[PDB]
Amino acid sequence: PPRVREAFALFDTDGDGEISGRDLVLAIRSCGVSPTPDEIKALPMSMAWPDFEAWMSKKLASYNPEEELIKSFKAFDRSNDGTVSADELSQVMLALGELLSDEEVKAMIKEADPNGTGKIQYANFVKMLLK
Amino acid sequence: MVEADEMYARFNARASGGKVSTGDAMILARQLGLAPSYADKQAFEEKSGDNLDYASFQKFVGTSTHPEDNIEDLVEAFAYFDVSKHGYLTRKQMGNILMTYGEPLTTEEFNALAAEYFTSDQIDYRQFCKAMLEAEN
Amino acid sequence: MASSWEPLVSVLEAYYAGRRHKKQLLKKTPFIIRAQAHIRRHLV
Ligand SMILES: [Ca+2]
Ligand SMILES: [Cl-]
């Protein structure tokens, strides 16, 4: 199914047709979009599906998730080999992260490094995450 | 079999050339007290087409009994949207849920269901689920 | 002069929280369909 519609449906946790609060931000981030803090500031108290749909259409018209995520990774591609280290990413997720169990983070790493290399080819990974 | 002569007559009253559409199979199966899904209709269509004679209708009916139906799984389905787990969902919640997930209701189906079954804004989804499993046979 | 990891972390956390949502909702979806089938039965 389409990503935006599905993200709304997934992050509307009580099924009342409306995302509110941090969930809103999470729904946005779950599409690969990092809202600048002023955008987060300006988010309404709640969004129904038409509101979320409009917000995401307008955002995505100017913001491209996969290349932005790729640039975020290439910040930490120290070797510059199109590849960041899985260990760094794991313990940074464990350190700064707020939502996933440690088991979840390990599952994620096994996804990103499907060959036991300790290196994450982050382009391939981001493309895998964006259907 | 459940009232064999009257099932036969209802099928034939809708039948043209001894066959009825799978949509009429759905309605007839409901009147008999079965609860086929649209997935059942699709699966049956892709082996037997869109027109059933009386025998293939009987086979359809026989495969739509859904023995996995039970109260706890139905209730857990709704309780998924209940953050309090107190056992209540609002009419807004029931409507958006039922018209968004699974095989979504049309607004007309939901409005008819709500007119008959939703007495309040705070719906006990456990009792509503029990009600829905009643008369099934 | 390393940069900060919070944006990447935030986005991946949200993504995988959504994947966990999609999977538990997958567990629940067949019985929502069952509910809807019984609803339509009561509605003839
Ligand atoms: Ca909500
Ligand atoms: Cl944050």
Numbering used by the authors:
A (entry chain A): 4 to 134
B (entry chain B): 77 to 213
C (entry chain C): 775 to 818
The paper states:
Proliferation and transmission of these obligate endoparasites in their host organisms rely on efficient cell invasion. This active process is based on the motility of the parasite, referred to as gliding, and is empowered by an actin/myosin motor. Actin polymerization occurs between the plasma membrane (PM) and the inner membrane complex (IMC) whereas myosin A is part of the glideosome, which binds the essential light chains ELC and myosin light chain MLC1 (called myosin tail interacting protein, MTIP, in Plasmodium spp.). MLC1 (in P. falciparum: myosin A tail-interacting protein, MTIP) binds at the very C-terminus of MyoA, while ELC is expected to interact with the C-terminus of MyoA upstream of MLC115. We demonstrate that ELCs bind to a conserved binding site on MyoA to induce its α-helical secondary structure and stiffen the MyoA neck.
The successful formation of trimeric assemblies of MyoA with its light chain proteins allowed us to crystallize and determine the structures of the following complexes: (i) T. gondii MLC1/TgMyoA-C/TgELC1 complex at 2.4 Å resolution (hereafter named complex 1) and (ii) T. gondii MLC1/TgMyoA-C/TgELC2 complex at 2.3 Å resolution (hereafter named complex 2). TgMyoA folds into an extended α helix with a characteristic kink between residues 801–803 (angle of 139° in complex 1 and 137° in complex 2). Both TgELCs display a typical calmodulin fold with one N-terminal and one C-terminal lobe, with each lobe comprising two EF hands. Clear additional electron density was visible only in the first EF hand of each complex and assigned to a calcium ion coordinated in a tetragonal bipyramidal geometry. In complex 1, calcium is coordinated in a tetragonal bipyramidal geometry by the carboxyl groups of side chains D15, D17, D19, the carbonyl group of E21 and two water molecules. Complexes 1 and 2 are monomeric in solution, but while the calculated scattering data of complex 1 fit the experimental scattering data with a Χ2 = 1.26, the structure of complex 2 displays a higher Χ2 = 2.41, indicative of small structural differences in solution. The electron density in complex 2 reveals an additional α helix for this area, which is absent in complex 1, suggesting that residues 66–77 are disordered. TgMyoA residues 762–818, which constitute the lever arm, maintained a continuous α helix after energy minimization, with both TgELC1 and TgELC2 forming a small number of contacts with the TgMyoA converter domain.
